[PDB]
Ligand SMILES: CC(C)[C@@H](NC(=O)[C@H](CS)NC(=O)CCC[C@H](N)C(=O)O)C(=O)O
């Protein structure tokens with residue numbers, strides 16, 4: 001019933017060289033991360049009007065033929081190499097949500113991780129240029145725009161924890177990041193299929209159940225339709241929508257590294273019968289990236305938790321999320 005306190009943080013100093021101003025941003029990241037776990041990043045420099053318009057044009061013009069040709073393995077047995085990247089189909093009358101996921105544009109057939117067949121690395125699939133002119137160029141450019149924003153955010157998290165600003169960002173590299181963009185369409189449907197609505201223990205109608213994120217951080221743009229709720233000790237609280245800002249939260253890899261000092265907030269998606277967009281960028285590191293866990297509450301920072309390689313974390317995490325909350 002209540003509304004979550006989600007502050008709006010001007011992140012523009014993180015692109016600059018005024019070190020005190022960066023510290024003032026870091027303090028606000030720290031405070032939000034220790035409270036509900038969510039904040040809006042504002043003054044971020046990304047053209048989100050164009051993001052939303054180009055995503056809508058793609059979602060509304062793609063045909064069933066094209067969806068089959070781009071489908072991940074869960075929907076097309078022919079595409080055994082597409083576990084992450086491709087189209088995630090809706091099922092008329094049963095499943096409302098549909099989406100398109102793409103990975104690092106640098107993952108080509110000649111990339112060494114692709115040649116080694118390393119798990120979680122795939123080459124992106126794209127629609128025909130002539131049916132969707134400019135879409136691939138836009139989407140690859142967007143990847144690097146949100147990469148740049150995420151790199152700056154990571155400097156803020158580092159300073160917030162008392163570390164040098166490259167503590168996380170040094171592991172977040174264009175040549176090997178496992179980060180993904182997902183372009184999700186939540187449709188207006190009348191009648192809305194009952195199989196696509198889940199009922200929470202507390203009676204709330206949901207589109208996606210409670211979870212912690214599989215990410216270091218999650219950088220999310222959504223249309224202006226309220227849908228997210230965050231769990232607190234006193235129950236779920238509504239996150240108000242803001243279609244000019246990016247909603248930021250930590251994933252479970254951050255909670256692991258920090259001995260839960262920055263928790264991964266549990267959140268869920270309420271069912272709303274409205275046409276809307278949900279466009280997450282999941283900040284993932286490289287396959288071999290390892291950050292030694294530390295405990296910010298302890299003077300010496302010592303913690304007993306085992307270091308975890310990002311690749312093993314991600315592979316287990318994505319499968320666990322499918323098993324718990326369903327194939328999307
Ligand atoms: C809550 C939003 C981020 C969005 N949900 C989501 O994106 C949910 C929960 S964080 N995320 C996932 O299913 C993980 C997708 C991972 C992606 N295929 C990849 O290979 O990297 C929604 O609107 O449902």
Ligand SMILES: [Fe+2]
Nearest residue numbers: 211212213267
């Ligand atoms: Fe999430």
